[PDB]
Ligand binder design. Sequence first.
Ligand SMILES: */C(=C/C(=O)N1CCN(CC2CCN(c3cc4c(cc3F)C(=O)N([C@@H]3CCC(=O)NC3=O)C4=O)CC2)CC1)[C@H](C[C@H]1CCNC1=O)NC(=O)[C@@H](CC(C)C)NC(=O)OCc1ccccc1
Ligand SMILES: */C(=C/C(=O)N1CCN(CC2CCN(c3cc4c(cc3F)C(=O)N([C@@H]3CCC(=O)NC3=O)C4=O)CC2)CC1)[C@H](C[C@H]1CCNC1=O)NC(=O)[C@@H](CC(C)C)NC(=O)OCc1ccccc1
Lengths: 306, 306
Amino acid sequence: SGFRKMAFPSGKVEGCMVQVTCGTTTLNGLWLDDVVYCPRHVICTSEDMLNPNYEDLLIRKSNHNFLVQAGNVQLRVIGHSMQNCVLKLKVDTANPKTPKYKFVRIQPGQTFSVLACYNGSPSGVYQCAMRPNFTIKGSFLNGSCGSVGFNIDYDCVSFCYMHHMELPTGVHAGTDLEGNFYGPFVDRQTAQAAGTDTTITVNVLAWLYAAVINGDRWFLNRFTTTLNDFNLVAMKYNYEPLTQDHVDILGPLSAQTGIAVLDMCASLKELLQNGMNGRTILGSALLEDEFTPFDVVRQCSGVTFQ
Amino acid sequence: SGFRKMAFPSGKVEGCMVQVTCGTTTLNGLWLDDVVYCPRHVICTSEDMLNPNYEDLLIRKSNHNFLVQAGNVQLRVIGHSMQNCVLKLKVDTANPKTPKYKFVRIQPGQTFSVLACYNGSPSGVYQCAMRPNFTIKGSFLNGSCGSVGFNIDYDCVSFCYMHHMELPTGVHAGTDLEGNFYGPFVDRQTAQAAGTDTTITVNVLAWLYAAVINGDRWFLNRFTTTLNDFNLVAMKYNYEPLTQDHVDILGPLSAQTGIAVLDMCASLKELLQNGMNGRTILGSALLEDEFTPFDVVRQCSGVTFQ
Ligand SMILES: */C(=C/C(=O)N1CCN(CC2CCN(c3cc4c(cc3F)C(=O)N([C@@H]3CCC(=O)NC3=O)C4=O)CC2)CC1)[C@H](C[C@H]1CCNC1=O)NC(=O)[C@@H](CC(C)C)NC(=O)OCc1ccccc1
Ligand SMILES: */C(=C/C(=O)N1CCN(CC2CCN(c3cc4c(cc3F)C(=O)N([C@@H]3CCC(=O)NC3=O)C4=O)CC2)CC1)[C@H](C[C@H]1CCNC1=O)NC(=O)[C@@H](CC(C)C)NC(=O)OCc1ccccc1
């Protein structure tokens, strides 16, 4: 038993990380087949980043202005092009460790693993949710851009995130692997607001179910509620509104624990209105919203990867 | 910026995981050079585990009673022996993906990465501390035994943990890779007590320093204290007593933040005595003790692995 924030094994993605240098900027790139993907802002100087004209900047760059290194081997760059906010560097060699993979654009509230890298060398792995406001709360230092996020379905890596920025609030922003930002952000060093950060209500409910499965139960009260009633309390606390879709997704956990979803809502409502009274749930003193229903089922069925 | 519980990249350890079956029990083994390490209780039936005589049980087992599988390839077992609570299975093939590695026995309060596995297939990676009472709080289901914990120093994997058991309190227990349990536990299905679980005071202080580095500062008060004075307050809250060794270890963070360690102690003391007043620190509503001074420095310097 027990329940922890857990990242996917990172082996398949480690084999795809490289170092991309242009001028004096170095960051990470993702090397799949004969293409290297990295943030287009590799082409910027510190001065450029205040207000870049990427199209004009890229025009000054040739294939040979891009240095790609895998360990100690230099890849030859035979083509380059800008897709939205990502630069695509064509090389003369297919990565012999390319896993089976997809590019996917994930939905708010979904989770994924980040392999944080510096100089194209993996540093560490942690779990992130795409928050409702299209930021993540990660751990990113200078040189970490180009680090990716991903999910694995058995042997298929689904890439969903590439790291580009930190906002003034200290949270993080980035693109899918087609170079389209999550959220209303742009790859420019200017003040940018993410909206109000709402809580992923369905995720909190899954975690409460997880808690019940791991024997955490003080919080289970004797009330039930309605979808509309709970949601009037959700909005007050900046919780995402709950839908029958969400109820159905929680269906397996509800069916396993024997707790109707609307009963768990009633218990969550009282949690929201009365706080935790200095207690903890699965080892936390606040309500956790970065575990999907899938994340908890995974960790109750013992799904493995190959 | 930002600060997260982060596991080491798991690629080098993934290549060492195999499946070990004996009779009808299946669990994980670690395949390094031409040896496979796994918990000796692979040789037990469900009935055996109530009171096993391992020596008598092992006597009935031959080399051929052990099935070792790497993916779909069966390794041939040419020798077996019991070292403490681990079984060592000699095979006719050296693992071609054996990384550089060490066996180390870690100290209480230190941290390490767990690669949770089932059927010799990696499932996920998370970070654990060897608590002062020699348990860990992990996420382990049936079939997860033989999963290992490790640290990486650049290219060297230091193996320090193999998973064996869950205690009645829901926490986890296991051995070093020489098969010696951490703590007073035995590989038998009987009620076993870990003592009082104390908090790793030095770790909490490192995390408070991390918080300061990431801009969390309400908790910084105007008091200082003495080592003996703080420790009189530590013991009351079941905190580990703080020593000049601990002070020195925090020296780099103290020197970077400009906060004397004893000032941080005074702030921690008031945190302990007055609680958090519904506030949070680095996104948590309680005091975190599973980040070592090394874990926070790592995440402030951007150390990478190769
Ligand atoms: C992600 C990636 C990124 O693009 N950068 C760019 C800046 N930086 C690299 C710096 C490092 C210092 N510097 C420099 C570097 C190098 C040399 C000289 C030099 F002056 C140099 O010679 N070399 C190599 C190696 C060293 C050497 O000796 N010889 C060489 O030839 C150098 O490498 C200039 C370049 C790294 C970051 C970040 C992600 C941030 C969030 C997470 N933490 C972050 O910093 N950059 C951005 O996000 C940035 C994108 C722009 C809009 C284009 N925006 C941003 O987030 O800014 C706000 C911010 C920044 C930091 C913290 C908080 C907020
Ligand atoms: C770690 C490892 C471990 O050794 N075990 C042993 C028991 N279990 C395997 C079971 C599973 C059910 N069962 C069985 C298995 C298989 C077949 C038939 C069958 F009846 C079978 O035919 N096969 C294969 C595959 C299936 C098939 O169709 N054909 C085959 O041939 C089978 O595999 C009997 C064997 C898995 C666990 C755990 C770690 C615990 C902590 C973390 N979660 C845990 O469960 N075991 C222990 O820790 C245990 C060690 C003993 C002291 C020796 N002690 C313990 O923790 O017990 C208390 C406890 C247990 C669970 C939860 C909480 C507390």
